[PDB]
Amino acid sequence: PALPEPFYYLHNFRAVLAWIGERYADLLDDQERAFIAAFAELPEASQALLVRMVMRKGTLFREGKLAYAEIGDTRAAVQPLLALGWVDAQPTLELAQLFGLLKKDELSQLFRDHLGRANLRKDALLERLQPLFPEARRLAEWQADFAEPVYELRCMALCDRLRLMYFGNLWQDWSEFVLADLGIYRYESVEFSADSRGFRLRADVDAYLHLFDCRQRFDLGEPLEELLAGLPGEPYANPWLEGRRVKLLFQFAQHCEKQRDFDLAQRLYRQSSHPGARLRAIRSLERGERFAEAHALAREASCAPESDAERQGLARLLPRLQGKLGLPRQARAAAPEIDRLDLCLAFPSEPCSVEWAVREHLEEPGCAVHYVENGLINSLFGLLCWEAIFAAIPGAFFHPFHSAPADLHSADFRQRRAALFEACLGRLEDGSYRDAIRCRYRDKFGLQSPFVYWELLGEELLEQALDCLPAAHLRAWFERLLEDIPGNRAGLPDLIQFWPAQRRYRMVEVKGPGDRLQDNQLRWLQFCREREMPVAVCYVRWHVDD
DNA sequence: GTTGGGATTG
DNA sequence: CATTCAA
DNA sequence: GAATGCTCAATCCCAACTT
């Protein structure tokens, strides 16, 4: 869609280098400063060519796929990069990499004397020929008549280290700059300290890179024996880093449980503080026929549960373990009688998921039904509390592209922000919360945020929600979300219906045939019907006339 | 000729 | 989380 | 009662599939 400067991407890259120079100046090593300075020495076209290679996929390129008009002649622009070693000409290629660079026609002809196989695909061709050609070669040693040179980028690790230093993570690309400049991504602007940055110590960057590496190798099928040997056993000082580690241990354990190695899964879950891990360790011990440990851990956990999810899970585990130890059957109570509404509806032909069906059936004159499912309540929260969620609390925002503060999932996130929350939530006690939300809605429309789904929240659903929802219910929900954000942001009922005449609402969780209530949904039903909130669960059967 | 997936571009 | 498994 | 399969559209290139 034509940004006016043909070098827009190079401009952005220079912006990141400068930014890292001022904010990270104390964290950079010798190789890094040499890279930034050397890059500043490059002629514009070689700078541009570099950034082009960095932003594309993989490290290997054919000269002809590197044509660009701002740069002109590619060979000329690449020569200064060859002199620094940041690009190899004539690298050494594994057969698979040769297969990445080459067309299937060229490859079919090249090895034609070893192909009697069949007409068959490219990946199969690679498979058949790999036991034949294990030894890597330069491109010239593969075929000497191939007339297009091939370049390999050699600085990608140092670039990824720069990316992660600027963004505080590796998932965000440099195209963040162009997508925000084009208005495809619109981020809220925070004014944060000129000393604000993602990483404090160099070793914390080093560690993020090590965990990231570990996840990569695991995803490639590496045995956990050397994976675990490589991880640190001791927990990290930096807590947000210990989150990454602890998540990784968690997935290792899940993989183990899949392999039915229950003792190791238990071990790995037990050394992780990841939310829900203790539960998975009890359940793993039970699966490993280790009942006494499972029971012990379950009693430990029930003394001081981590979450409501953990309370609910122990409620099933404990009695089954008690039974497995031959302990007396302990009396319990029935579920709090979910308030249910049965519907027998036409068979659609064709589907038409069931939630749309109930939503149609419940919509009459006078009744408005919306398929929202925790997007409306979270949105109302994010609108009211916007000014606290985006507060300039130090270390919460270090660059223009945050969709959420960095500490959003930290334990004292609310404490750090305390006043500003009881300010915002306070507007629920006077009348001002409606106006405040409508203005925040108009001001902030489209801005990326953790809790506000704008696509879902049209002006009409906003107005009906505002005038039909009690403020005290809003406060109840909003405090429940704040208490544990990541465990409570999901599970609200599929539908919500409004009767704007009498300003009334009811939420409806929809369940088709073969559908049952998840755990979080059940906790939200319990929470709602302890407030005498209007929730109902709707179970649907289909009618086929024959 | 003709789709369809993935890399690329702004 | 929406399909499969267990009596 | 429980075990498990990081968001844009428009465009260009290359593999696969028709007769």
Swiss-Prot record:
Q: What class of enzyme is it?
A: hydrolase
Q: What is this protein called?
A: Fanconi-associated nuclease 1 homolog
The record's remark on the cofactor is: Binds 2 magnesium or manganese ions per subunit.
What EC identifiers does the entry list?
Answer: 3.1.4.1
Species of origin: Pseudomonas aeruginosa (strain ATCC 15692 / DSM 22644 / CIP 104116 / JCM 14847 / LMG 12228 / 1C / PRS 101 / PAO1)
InterPro entries, alphabetized: Fan1-like, FAN1-like_WH, FAN1_SAP_bact, tRNA_endonuc-like_dom_sf, VRR_NUC
GO BP, sorted A to Z: interstrand cross-link repair
As its record notes, the protein acts as a catalyst of:
Hydrolytically removes 5'-nucleotides successively from the 3'-hydroxy termini of 3'-hydroxy-terminated oligonucleotides
The entry's function note states:
Nuclease required for the repair of DNA interstrand cross-links (ICL). Acts as a 5'-3' exonuclease that anchors at a cut end of DNA and cleaves DNA successively at every third nucleotide, allowing to excise an ICL from one strand through flanking incisions. Also has endonuclease activity toward 5'-flaps.
Q: Which cofactor does it need?
A: Mn(2+); Mg(2+)
Q: Where does Mn(2+) 2 bind?
A: E373, D494
